[PDB]
């Protein structure tokens, strides 16, 4: 029947930001090797919606 | 350009985001105690 201290949230809350910058840096640093691609094939069809 | 200081920041925001999480398990909490006593 524990209770997170102030200290515990603190260190759980500051500790998951983190990880978010770093994934965002990352997305940011994924600016130089992605491969673009030559963006067709846009549509479904007919005999998938049914 | 951004890229120095994103190179940077996703190693000081990638160990730190390990380090800050591996302690939470030995983080303290608060335990509620009960306790019946006898005659009432």
């Given at each position: 029947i524990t209770?997170?201290?102030?200290?515990?949230?603190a260190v759980m809350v500051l500790g998951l930001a983190c990880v978010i910058g770093?994934?965002?840096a990352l997305a940011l640093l994924d600016?130089?090797?992605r491969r673009r691609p030559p963006r067709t094939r846009g549509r479904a069809?007919?005999?998938t919606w049914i | 350009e951004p890229s120095?200081?994103?190179?940077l920041i996703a190693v000081v925001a990638?160990?730190?985001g390990v380090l800050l999480c591996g302690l939470v398990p030995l983080l303290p909490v608060e335990?509620?105690?009960?306790?019946?006593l006898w005659p009432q």
């Amino acid at each position: 029947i524990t209770s997170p201290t102030l200290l515990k949230t603190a260190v759980m809350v500051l500790g998951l930001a983190c990880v978010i910058g770093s994934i965002v840096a990352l997305a940011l640093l994924d600016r130089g090797w992605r491969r673009r691609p030559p963006r067709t094939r846009g549509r479904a069809g007919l005999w998938t919606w049914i | 350009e951004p890229s120095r200081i994103a190179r940077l920041i996703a190693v000081v925001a990638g160990i730190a985001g390990v380090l800050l999480c591996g302690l939470v398990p030995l983080l303290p909490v608060e335990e509620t105690t009960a306790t019946v006593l006898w005659p009432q």
